[PDB]
Design a protein around this ligand. Structure first.
Ligand SMILES: Nc1ncnc2c1ncn2[C@@H]1O[C@H](COP(=O)(O)OP(=O)(O)O)[C@@H](O)[C@H]1O
Ligand SMILES: Nc1ncnc2c1ncn2[C@@H]1O[C@H](COP(=O)(O)OP(=O)(O)O)[C@@H](O)[C@H]1O
Ligand SMILES: Nc1ncnc2c1ncn2[C@@H]1O[C@H](COP(=O)(O)OP(=O)(O)O)[C@@H](O)[C@H]1O
Ligand SMILES: Nc1ncnc2c1ncn2[C@@H]1O[C@H](COP(=O)(O)OP(=O)(O)O)[C@@H](O)[C@H]1O
Ligand SMILES: Nc1ncnc2c1ncn2[C@@H]1O[C@H](COP(=O)(O)OP(=O)(O)O)[C@@H](O)[C@H]1O
Lengths: 268, 310, 335, 317, 316, 333
């Protein structure tokens, strides 16, 4: 019910009763998570600016962590583009009646931050004080991990989030995909990407997708076209399907292959 | 100076509390069963009314109140209650002992700004009428209290999750507790033998140092029963104008037994809207059985998050 | 230059309970009589303390220090004030716990310096001489919100101004006593400060308190007695008290009724005595106050067993909250 | 501004790989056993034969390539190889991971000068002449962009060889991505020799080779084997004559069996002393009277600890 | 220009060792049983004697003396005892190993304050630290310009002292290399360490075990002297001698009872029980002590090791 | 400019036990002959020690350094000092320990870069004794220390790079001796990779006595506490313990180097003692027995005048055992 549980809180936010809470979209990492998160801004009204930032996009060196929580909140409105240090000290005072004036209306933002369990206790703090505003928007989160030690303390918490805030938001999990659900995804992303494939090639493309990854299959759709271009065949047959598999793997295979390599080296 | 600062409140934390308006006692010192929203807590509410009189008889001199109860057992409840029987419009501000980990405000400053949220006529409002400036509004209230035109009244301070405060803030809290003006503070835990942050080597009850424990008083709230639980949400639906079915109260109480209460009570406003999907009026059973599998808690999610992560 | 008469500025909550002792209760030959001067029992701890009072008076106390190690709840800080009252009518006395040095309002050494200023006595103490010439105060809790800076050059300035009034003849200087409760909280960065302060002439005498035996020292990685380095474990005088008897209990409990003017029947004095040695003595005396104003609610001002066996059930003890919350979270682990 | 800066390249980092001339590729999309500098390890070379197609059709959008293998499977070899097939003096900077912990500088400045080492005219060398710093950055970024909009000198993105990756920290993984998702970004190809460990700077969060999923889906995975005693002699034989040392067939086959005792690099760095031993014995080639001499006088890596641990146990009781 | 800053020498640690006169041997380089205040330990005393004759012979370039020994045998006592055979009242600055962890003072700025209490100068003698308090970087700089002329003038003279540092295992890794670089410049004082522990990890590196908490490169420029435990057939003398300094008459069986304490616990606990024991005789109206007092005190005050056992068994 | 009068401030006593080292002692065909200029035994390293020295003259050493592994008592210093003489009659030899970077009078940069200049007529670090500021006063100015900046270096670097073609000024490689390498952490090693990129970087000899440990600064183990990327550019040479006869020539050198005479019975019992505890331990007892006979004035020590020193002055090893024996008497009740 990735689109059916999504419409539930989608009516409250334009009813006007999300105040004090926001969205967290957890799940497997990258399950169309940002994709359905962006689609909520597509499911929202006429001008809904979106952002997809990281849990560890705060740990920066040009900008400080406090700077990392001043900009994207202003981007997820936008007052950032009207801004682009203390440059906010004027325009926040100036537009205090420009919104009532009536040139361009104002909207909140559709802030999504990827993998919020990459945060710490000092940065969850500023989420509360920033969400006190009336222009403070609806926010969206992500994680894949439950009972996790919080960065900054000797105390764990599920979801990486302070336990009071875990009951001060709303919780989404994206449903994983099955054999037909992979079969529609790569098919849609075959005619989107328009390189001739025989009908059996879409079928076994799910067979590695259920084992290894999901963008691993779309990784080969440009390369195996060129080894098909190497024979000038103009359709990637079952050969290049079962050729580059030996050349291109995923890491949990490969790091295991060093793992079945390392032990006998430390044994004999 | 400019004394029209009428409403400065973080209204959202107390937003699910605007139904509670009385402890519900007799004059003679027992506890009613269900009056002004307070249900149960029969060995708990008399503890409130006792500290009511020791506030009023000027004998809360240098002592403290600790609330010990599991989450869902009404720790936020009775703290709001005490400010409702010492007259109305007494300041009441909830804070969490993890909030002091600000990035740009010193742990001195974020407390004193929230201390002066708790004393009214507030003290927090008179420093945001205009903008240290605190020293400039030292004399402003000084002339009023010797004019007798505005009174001085103590309030109540509420700290949650308080194991996440180190050794440091306690000694700011301990000494600043000891004026003849300072508002009384309610502690709130759910910890056993814990390790105090800041040392990692001193352990004690409640994650609290051995200095400020003997002068703290200890109150337990217990768990609930569903027939206690079912009247809570029945109180809630009338306060929000949302009609509801009988088996809805039977069904929703079970998740109060299952997880906790605060997970249960947030679910109305979407299930109200889930009824408005089909355009009906009552919250019939199919709306009630639909939500807890779609949306999660922190408890059963981290079970199914980490297990399906494997 | 206007403070000889702003003499005493202290807390009335710290000296608000323990007023019921004036002295230690001794004869000329260092024996007590088991009930005198407020101090009650464990006479061996009493009669050794007079030697510390004797050694102060003779001029050979210098460098040596006092430490009391007993169970938490047997009148550790109680013994130290009797030393003050048996040292004259006005000898200063400052109660400092272990964690009081970890200020964020000031550094780790100025408070311990300001600890030492309170224990230097002069009649018409040195610490209040500093606080008027430094800053202007005397307000309500608005100034208890913020702070000031205590200028260091003022302290040497009065140390140059005490070079006027000491040897002149107006002012005599009397050494007080400083008191450190729960000594196992202080890091080794301040133990050297205690080493570098006792050697002065007008340096006071120090009494420390604890409940810890062999432990890892705060600051280093070494298990030691009392959380104290070895070199400063040995210049000390160390006394130990037992847990209290039951004849000792009602002996204090009688004296702790007239302080809070409570008039108690002969049923409570049974059960408060047995409950007093079950949780703590400190939890018992705390219960006396609140049960009294339930008695006025039930109309008749003589406390019988009904209020006490309600307020013990209303207000739990910390020794079973650490059971009850632990027994809850035991049931939390079971899936 | 001053375009005559002829020599700024650390030649000793590219000294032991001079003998590569190509990948040795087919127009059939295959490789050969010995061609233009390489020997063996064909699908490893042919996976580069895949990436040279998408580096010339510009299909590496946001993408890069890791190399995975034990030490001595030619990880530096394929690294310096690809700059040749990209054509006409592609700039190259080998960068190890742990070259970033210096007290003179913060960690991010070591990286951007390598970013300005990566892409005739390079970006690091413009900033050495002009001084006699981050203030200098846009004033040189403007002018050659003005020159390329005038059409003065071409600017082709090069190859970055990020070596020794498992001791890299967190804040650079975040830092690297921001210029990576441009079109002016160069290729940043990895090498690794350490498995399942914690990302440095998280201290608890493990990852395959300590790199986050942030990067693990944008980077392409290749796996190598280890060399057989047939194949590795041609590695030694080619480097023996580019170092210009006459060698018999006889003693060389005693040299190679050390290459399955320790790494291949321990085999090759003793070539220069063992030759200069024989110039004291007064010959011009080397025979078996030298390979028995050197490997009992210059010790390896792993036996150096293994000797000392085996006798320290009895010395300190 | 001041040559009277004579208010020096904090004394309260060394005031408990007034009885010691030096080392006191024969011309044959062997030990007497009780001479120049010192009593017993005939083993290690010629080890002082061979070392101290190397001092005037100037053989000790870049060397030091360790004193490995249990707590409470007189490792302070022998350390003072060689500082009277340097003669002409050389300075002697003991300290504590944990005196370097202070609050406002940098860790280098105490060792300068330590070393300048070891560099001594109608001839009167002061330390270099004394001429530092006479004027109170260049604050401690321009006091070189006073003294470098004077040995070139030929009136005052530089003499070396004894920087006896006790309980070295608290010290971290930084002060060693500041010591070691400053151990052997030209006329730096003789450095003597003492401690009581075995394999001690150096503070700050957490993996290198080492003997006595010392980095291993330094220790092999240092000579190691030990001192055993005492026997009660002579251990009676030292407390009797110390009390003979303070005019205290005591009975003998009480001192024979007092000898049990020095066997059960430290000698440092043992000599403590005189002045808070003799003062009780004045209350009972006696000048000399009898067996009741040393009895009565022994249950009144407890030692640190006694404080360890009784507290934990009554804690649980 | 005003600094050619900087001839030497040499170390004489800290390198003062290693007086009797005057070369490696080789053959022209690079063969050991076991008795020449002090080196007794240890041919296995010393035969290999001649090899790198030949690679130094041919310029084949850039990108390669020497690591010596050995126990306490098998010549980490002598073979290092033995390479100094045959490389040149006057070369800089600088023998700091790894702990010397852990000073509080400077950061870890300024300790090593100054130590790095120390092995480059005169030394490049010796120029910084006057041409930065004036130090070298009476002994109390060892106790304090000021800071030289980087500004003095490029002014000093400007003369000698352009006095290089003058003929009066010359540059010569020294050798840097880093004792106890695992004390250092990877904050310092990455500085050393930039150090050996230069043209005039001297040759590098480092010392160790450990096997597998962890790198300090991070959480991964390696050989020696050095990461692989520096290990794979090394020449690796270990040594062997001396035998009893090997010492029997060794101890004859230093007593000959300090004009004392010991008995033929007393000789072999002394190397019994050195083979009991430590080779370094046998050294300190000697002059410590020299004063012993000087009271009885017998001008040659005997064996009874040795054990008196041995009864007094302990070793490092039994100094640990007796402390654990008293520590046995503490924790056992
Ligand atoms: N005893 C109670 N009776 C009625 N309503 C309550 C009671 N306790 C809490 N509530 C309501 O349920 C919600 C949960 O509050 P509470 O249980 O006090 O905090 P917690 O769940 O953290 O213990 C609050 O909004 C409060 O209004
Ligand atoms: N012998 C005694 N005489 C008088 N009061 C005593 C005696 N023993 C204990 N008390 C009382 O017990 C209480 C505990 O004192 P204190 O030392 O502050 O606490 P703790 O015993 O926890 O250390 C004090 O009120 C003190 O008056
Ligand atoms: N196929 C090959 N062709 C040419 N040289 C090779 C080949 N494989 C290995 N080598 C040589 O072996 C050495 C290995 O270097 P490097 O890649 O650092 O080892 P590793 O693969 O362990 O990282 C290089 O000098 C390289 O020239
Ligand atoms: N041989 C001795 N001669 C004189 N005094 C001694 C002797 N041995 C011990 N003492 C005295 O006993 C005490 C023990 O000192 P020491 O052994 O250094 O241990 P600590 O430093 O812990 O007190 C000192 O006060 C010293 O005066
Ligand atoms: N082969 C040797 N030739 C000359 N002297 C030696 C030899 N081996 C050891 N020594 C002497 O033993 C001492 C050991 O010095 P050093 O090399 O620093 O210690 P280690 O032997 O532990 O490496 C030195 O005084 C040195 O003169």
């Amino acid at each position: 019910a990735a689109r059916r549980a999504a419409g539930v809180v989608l009516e409250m936010i334009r009813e006007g009763k999300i105040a004090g809470r926001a969205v967290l979209i957890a799940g497997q990492p990258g399950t169309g998570k940002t994709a359905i998160a962006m689609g909520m801004a597509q499911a929202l009204g006429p001008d809904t600016p979106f952002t997809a930032i990281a849990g560890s996009e705060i740990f920066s060196l040009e900008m400080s962590k406090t700077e990392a929580l001043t900009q994207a909140f202003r981007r997820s409105i936008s007052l950032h583009e009207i801004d682009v240090s203390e440059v906010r000290e004027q325009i926040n005072a100036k537009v205090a009646e420009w919104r009532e004036e009536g040139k361009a209306e104002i909207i909140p933002g559709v802030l999504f931050i990827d993998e919020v369990h990459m945060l710490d206790i000092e940065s969850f703090s500023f989420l509360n004080r920033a969400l006190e505003s009336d222009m403070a928007p609806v926010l969206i989160m992500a994680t894949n991990r439950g009972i996790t030690r919080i960065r900054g303390t000797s105390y764990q918490s599920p979801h990486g989030i302070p336990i009071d805030l875990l009951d001060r938001l709303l919780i989404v999990s994206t449903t994983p995909y099955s054999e037909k659900d992979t079969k529609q995804i790569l098919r849609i992303r075959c005619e989107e990407e328009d390189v001739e494939m025989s009908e059996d090639a879409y079928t076994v493309l799910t067979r590695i997708g259920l084992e290894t990854s999901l963008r691993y299959a779309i990784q080969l759709i440009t390369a195996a076209s060129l080894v098909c271009r190497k024979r000038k065949g103009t359709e990637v047959q079952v050969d290049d399907i079962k050729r580059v598999y030996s050349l291109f793997l995923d890491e949990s295979r490969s790091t295991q292959y060093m793992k079945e390599y390392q032990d006998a080296f430390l044994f004999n | 100076k400019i004394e029209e600062v009428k409403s400065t409140t973080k209204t959202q934390r107390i937003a699910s509390h605007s139904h509670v308006k009385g402890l519900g006692l007799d004059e003679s010192g027992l506890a009613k069963q269900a009056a002004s929203g307070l249900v149960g807590q029969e060995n708990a509410r008399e503890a409130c009314g006792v500290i009511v009189e020791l506030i009023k008889s000027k004998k809360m001199a240098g002592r403290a109140v600790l609330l010990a109860g599991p989450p869902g057992t009404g720790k936020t409840a009775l703290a709001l209650a005490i400010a409702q029987e010492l007259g109305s419009k007494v300041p009441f501000c909830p804070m969490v002992g993890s909030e002091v980990y600000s990035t740009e405000i010193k742990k001195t400053e974020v407390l004193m700004e929230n201390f002066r949220r708790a004393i009214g006529l507030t003290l927090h409002d008179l420093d945001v009428a205009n903008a240290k400036l605190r020293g400039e509004i030292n004399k402003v209230v000084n002339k009023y209290i010797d004019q007798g035109i505005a009174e001085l009244v103590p309030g109540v301070l509420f700290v949650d999750e308080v194991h996440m405060l180190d050794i440091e803030c306690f000694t700011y809290l301990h000494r600043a507790l000891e004026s003849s003006i300072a508002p009384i503070v309610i502690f709130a835990s759910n910890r056993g033998n814990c390790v105090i942050r800041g040392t990692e080597d001193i352990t004690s009850p409640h994650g609290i140092p051995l200095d400020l424990l003997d002068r703290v008083m200890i109150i337990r709230t217990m768990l609930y029963t569903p027939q206690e639980m079912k009247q809570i949400i029945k109180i809630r639906a009338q306060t929000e104008g949302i009609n509801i079915s009988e088996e809805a109260l039977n069904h929703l109480g079970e998740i109060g037994t299952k997880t906790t209460l605060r997970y249960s009570v947030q679910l109305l406003t979407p299930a109200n809207l889930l009824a408005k999907i089909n355009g009906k009026d009552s919250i019939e059973k199919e709306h009630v059985e639909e939500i807890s599998e779609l949306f999660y808690d922190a408890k059963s999610s981290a079970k199914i998050l980490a297990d399906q992560q494997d």
